[PDB]
Design a protein around this ligand. Structure first.
Ligand SMILES: NC(=O)C1=CN([C@@H]2O[C@H](COP(=O)(O)OP(=O)(O)OC[C@H]3O[C@@H](n4cnc5c(N)ncnc54)[C@H](OP(=O)(O)O)[C@@H]3O)[C@@H](O)[C@H]2O)C=CC1
Ligand SMILES: [Zn+2]
Lengths: 340, 134, 95, 126, 208, 114, 86
């Protein structure tokens, strides 16, 4: 092993971790906390960014001097990927879009770009690659997201035979689109569901648990080539989950059934703007998709991570949405939601 | 290969030729991933299911005092008595002296500068040998 | 007098250039390794040896109070020129 | 009476704010500092010094400086007697070891011995 | 000695020696030593049971009149068993003069607060709580004043290192500025500058 | 051995003062969780206050536990009056710190620390 | 299983080691001829109490006090060590 990448120090900010990471999609939600958790070990983190540099500014206080290297990249560009991953020893792929745009469908984001990154990481000599797929990703799902992500899963597995594929089930956090989606349908008209949302089952996994799983996947040589399934400790129906969301935020709650006659058409009624979409038909088909149980896969128990449940962090998430009249409330006020 | 520590790189009890025990202090840490030697042997005893009854260096020194207690009393010469009993035990095995002369292998100035594992790896000692053999 | 490594990186006058597998070339990806190109050891070789006629010469680097402190150089060695300790200049007794 | 009896051990390890990691894993060393053999002066060898063990000093990957993680690395305390230093090390609970003051033996120099008659201690030149 | 050497003020030395004998022979219960420096300043080294009865003399007596408390100072010396050397500096505007009153304590013996004599010390010895840990009983609001609120320890004690035991950095995980163990990017390079030749022979300490 | 006391004559009054300080913190913890709008529970906060009290559990010196009472009163006054912030209270819950090695084998693996 | 080495610690100038000294001044040599393959390590030290360490197989070490003992008592303890082999 090379003399500059030998791990030194007491594992703090100015230590050396022995990790040179290339974190694709680092300017989103998971890349935020991943660069935050890698920078406190002193890992030389290459951050490839596509967006404005200003939108990357919040990544700068996350490490020591020279421990985060920002560089431009494009998704359809082999040159930028080979320019970015040639010096690394772990390449984490967090590239995802919850919505398709004019320039990128789900096939570009989930099939083209991960196969390009995994192909270059094989043909440039990277020891560890890590890919992030969704737990409900299947070939014959009714959503474009899970179909393209399962096809990209199979491609990344077959073109890089040691790619650590990770399945987080459903991630909730501060800048998420899971609890922030369930809390930001309050003044639209009454939180629409299908058959009152008691037909689909979820288990939300907490983002610090997923990030510590990614850290322990970088650390563990036994974790090469596996397919990890990160899930939370408690399974919930969607109906009592949304009960708990509107009961932590202390909000009015009058749900109604909106059937398949017109709740896929409220996509093309409610993304008539070309901006960042509030909902879409893929979001409808994924929120109303149950979380499949895969007990044979190794999970957060098999990487030394205690999975933190929903109730200990939902107040930390959803304090933002209370008006004023119960900002001085507690966690010991709301009764915890029913598990299944 | 298990990489070890040097003499400048570990707190370390040595003995001179007169029985005086002394200890070094850590000038620099050992380079790379190389650890201190008894730390390595104790970790090997932990892996092999034969865990030695110490964790820290002072407990190693208490073990050392159990084995021979003059090795925890630094900069103190203890007078070893009882030459008579060793003399009487030397009268048993009458080994025959050879006729070959007692010639030490360090005859010249060339034989000094390269003796042990450190002095052979020095470019300065190489310049000394190159300078005294020209 | 700058030469170039087989990796594709310039060489300083100290002699430092990174390995092919050292990750710390990634700070130069998309940027440039600002090295100097006026090497002092190659610029002091262009100075001709000052032919003087004394035995002890006094060198101060020129300028008077703007050079190095004034030292004295013995020149009795005819095989070796008398190199100044500070400025790198060198003198020669011509006889 | 306004004076209480305290026969307990004088310990302030819970009052100096020092974390436990830098108490029970640090080896304080009380020593008269040896004379630098480049020099002939002994004014530096007058007062006792308490130093500590050296922890790790690694290379900063940006520049090449000696980064460290030890706060008590640069700490060298000055004392006048050995007993004050031992009482200070037993006051703050630091596990210590003590070297002794090794003064030179008073030499028997005689200038006539440079020019003797029958002794081996003559000089071959001057 | 004409251009560069400081002119010696024998008048100030004789007057401060007379006033030092005065303060000594009035208060033999607390005044331990009386010294006058070579640059004409007075120091009344006392016992810590005489914080109030000495200063109340110097605040009030008609030939002292030291109405102003200029600066209260603690000096930590590790080699003494009473390690803290609390220093009162008094200014008399009428007698145009200054006096220095020097008391001592260790970490655990409390020194009596002098806020009843001079209210100016309401922060100063309070600072000596924060910077050294000397406790001052009968003080109204005795708490830390210069360090941060979550600061454990006392900084100006000489066993406290130069860099602390905690550093602050912002952390986007908990969205908060948090304290972690310090890892300096460059070590503070200590320079062994003390030259081993005796710089001042008149300050020589006689041997053991 | 005859030194001046601070507030306690012997260990009994010192235990009384430590006991009243623990009473004050036991009363204090729900207010600290409420008005600072923390993310912790009263069970977790009171167990952390129990850990902070049991951290100093080896002292038999009355002056030392008197100064610990006084510094706990300073922490209490900095907590009742809002002088600490959210961060100065959450510095006790060392959450951002990575889990440190405890056994011999991991301390052998990561560095040269005893 | 069996004895592997013996360690006899003593002082030089203490009277408490005196009879222990009396073990080595008269009785060691014919012991060493009796046990030529058995290392009996004698260690003198500054002001230690006399001590006997008997190392057996697999690391077991018996710990016998030897303070204030005469040479008969040291001899009886050492022959108990040689006869036990525990
Ligand atoms: N529901 C969930 O939260 C779960 C998500 N995952 C997966 O984990 C990954 C991370 O999720 P998350 O952080 O929430 O997503 P985000 O939307 O928060 O961030 C995704 C990042 O990818 C970048 N990106 C996406 N497409 C492109 C593109 N074509 N060109 C350049 N940059 C691109 C974005 O940068 P820019 O701003 O420049 O476009 C952004 O920084 C995704 O792949 C997701 O599928 C897995 C399990 C659960
Ligand atoms: Zn010159």
């Amino acid at each position: 092993l090379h003399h500059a990448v030998i791990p030194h120090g007491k594992g703090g900010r100015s230590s050396v971790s022995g990790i040179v990471a290339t974190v694709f999609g680092a300017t989103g939600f998971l890349g935020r906390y991943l660069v935050n958790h890698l920078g406190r070990m002193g890992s030389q983190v290459i951050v490839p960014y596509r967006c404005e540099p200003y939108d990357t500014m919040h990544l700068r206080p996350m490490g020591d001097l020279g421990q985060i290297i920002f560089m431009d990249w494009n998704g359809r560009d082999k040159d930028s990927i080979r320019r970015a991953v040639e010096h690394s020893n772990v390449v984490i792929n967090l590239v995802g879009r919850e919505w398709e745009t004019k320039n990128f469908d789900f096939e570009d984001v989930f099939v083209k770009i991960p196969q390009a990154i995994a192909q270059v990481s094989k043909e440039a000599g990277v020891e560890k690659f890590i890919h992030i797929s969704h737990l409900n990703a299947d070939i014959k799902s009714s959503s474009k997201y899970l179909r393209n992500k399962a096809v990209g899963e199979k491609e990344v597995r077959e073109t890089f035979p040691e790619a650590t594929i990770i399945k987080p089930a459903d991630i909730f956090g501060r800048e998420d689109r899971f609890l922030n989606y369930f809390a930001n349908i309050r003044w639209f008209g009454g939180v629409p569901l299908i058959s009152l949302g008691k037909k689909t089952v979820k288990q939300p996994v907490y983002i610090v648990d997923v990030t510590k799983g990614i850290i322990n996947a970088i650390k563990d040589p036994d974790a090469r080539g596996k397919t990890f399934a990160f899930v939370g400790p408690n399974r919930y129906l969607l109906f009592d989950l949304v009960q708990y969301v509107f009961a932590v935020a202390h909000r009015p709650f009058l749900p109604y059934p909106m059937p398949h006659f017109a709740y896929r058409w409220i996509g093309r009624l409610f993304e008539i703007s070309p901006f960042e979409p509030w909902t879409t038909r893929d979001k409808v088909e994924r929120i109303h998709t149950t979380d499949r149980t895969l007990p044979h896969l190794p999970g957060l128990e098999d990487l030394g991570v205690q999975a933190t449940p929903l109730e200990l962090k939902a107040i930390e998430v959803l304090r933002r949405h209370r008006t004023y009249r119960w900002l001085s409330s507690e966690i010991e006020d709301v009764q915890p939601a029913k598990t299944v | 290969i298990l990489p070890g520590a040097a003499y400048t790189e570990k707190s370390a009890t040595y003995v001179n030729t007169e029985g005086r025990a002394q200890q070094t202090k850590v000038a620099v840490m050992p380079p790379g991933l190389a650890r201190e030697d008894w730390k390595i042997i104790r970790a090997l005893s932990e892996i092999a299911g034969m865990t030695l009854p110490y964790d820290t260096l002072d407990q190693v020194r208490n073990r050392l005092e159990e084995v021979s207690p003059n090795l925890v009393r630094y900069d103190d010469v203890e007078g070893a008595n009882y030459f008579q009993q060793a003399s009487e035990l030397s009268k048993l095995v009458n080994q025959q002296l050879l006729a070959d002369p007692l010639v030490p292998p360090q005859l010249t100035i060339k034989d000094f500068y390269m003796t042990d594992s450190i002095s052979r790896a020095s470019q300065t000692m190489a310049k000394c040998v190159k300078a005294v053999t020209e | 007098g700058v030469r170039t490594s087989p990796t594709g990186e310039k060489v300083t006058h100290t002699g430092q250039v990174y390995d092919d597998e050292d990750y710390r070339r990634v700070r130069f990806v998309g940027r440039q390794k600002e090295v100097n190109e006026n090497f002092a050891i190659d610029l002091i070789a262009e100075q001709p040896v000052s032919q003087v006629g004394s035995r002890v010469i006094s060198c101060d680097g020129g300028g008077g109070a703007l050079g190095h402190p004034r030292v004295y150089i013995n020149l009795d060695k005819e095989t070796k020129t008398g190199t100044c300790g500070y400025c790198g200049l060198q003198f020669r007794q011509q006889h | 009476t306004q004076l209480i009896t305290v026969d307990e051990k004088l310990d302030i390890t819970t009052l100096t704010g020092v974390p436990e990691e830098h108490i029970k894993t640090r080896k304080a060393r009380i020593f008269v500092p040896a004379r630098n053999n480049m020099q002939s002066g002994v004014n530096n060898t007058k007062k006792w010094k308490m130093e500590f063990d050296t922890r790790e000093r690694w290379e900063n990957p940006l520049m090449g400086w000696a980064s460290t993680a030890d706060p008590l690395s640069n700490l060298v305390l000055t004392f006048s007697t050995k007993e004050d230093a031992i009482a200070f090390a037993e006051k703050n609970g630091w596990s210590y070891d003590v070297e002794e003051r090794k003064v030179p033996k008073p030499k028997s120099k005689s200038y006539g011995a440079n020019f003797s008659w029958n002794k081996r201690t003559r000089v071959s030149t001057k | 000695t004409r251009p560069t050497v400081r002119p010696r003020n024998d008048v100030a030395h004789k007057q401060l020696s007379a006033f030092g004998e005065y303060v000594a022979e009035i208060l033999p219960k607390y005044v331990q030593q009386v010294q006058v420096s070579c640059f004409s300043e007075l120091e009344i080294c006392i016992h810590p049971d005489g914080v109030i009865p000495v200063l109340t003399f110097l605040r009030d007596h008609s030939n002292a009149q030291f109405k102003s408390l200029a600066d209260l100072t603690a000096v930590d010396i590790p080699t003494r068993q009473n390690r803290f050397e609390i220093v009162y500096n008094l200014l008399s505007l009428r007698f145009n003069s200054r006096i220095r009153v020097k008391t001592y304590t260790d970490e655990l013996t409390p020194v009596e607060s002098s806020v009843s004599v001079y209210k100016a010390a309401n922060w100063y010895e309070r600072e000596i709580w924060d910077m050294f840990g000397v406790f001052f009983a009968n003080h109204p609001d005795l708490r830390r004043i210069l360090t941060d609120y979550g600061f454990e320890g006392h900084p100006f004690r000489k066993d406290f290192p130069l860099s602390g035991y905690v550093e602050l950095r912002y952390d986007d995980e908990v969205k908060r500025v948090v304290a972690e163990p310090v890892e300096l990017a460059q070590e503070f390079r200590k320079f062994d500058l003390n030259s081993p030749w005796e710089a001042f022979p008149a300050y020589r300490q006689p041997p053991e | 051995t005859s030194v001046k006391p601070i507030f306690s004559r012997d260990m009994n009054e010192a235990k009384r003062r430590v006991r009243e300080l623990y009473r004050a913190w036991y009363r204090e913890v729900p207010n600290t969780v409420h008005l600072f709008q923390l993310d912790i529970s009263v069970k977790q906060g009171r167990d952390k206050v129990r850990e902070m009290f049991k951290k100093n559990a080896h002292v038999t010196d009355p002056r030392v536990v008197d100064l610990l009472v006084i510094k706990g009163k300073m922490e209490l006054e900095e907590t009742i009056n809002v002088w600490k912030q959210r961060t100065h209270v959450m510095r006790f819950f060392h959450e951002t710190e990575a889990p440190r090695p405890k056994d011999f084998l991991s301390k052998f693996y990561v560095g040269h620390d005893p | 299983l069996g004895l592997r080495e013996i360690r006899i610690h003593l002082c030089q100038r203490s009277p408490g080691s005196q009879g222990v000294r009396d073990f080595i001044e008269k009785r060691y040599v014919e012991l060493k001829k009796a046990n030529p393959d058995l290392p009996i390590l004698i260690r003198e030290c500054s002001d230690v109490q006399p001590k006997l360490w008997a190392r057996y197989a697999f690391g077991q070490e018996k710990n016998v006090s030897l303070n204030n003992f005469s040479a008969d008592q040291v001899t009886r303890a050492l022959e108990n060590v040689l006869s036990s082999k525990a």
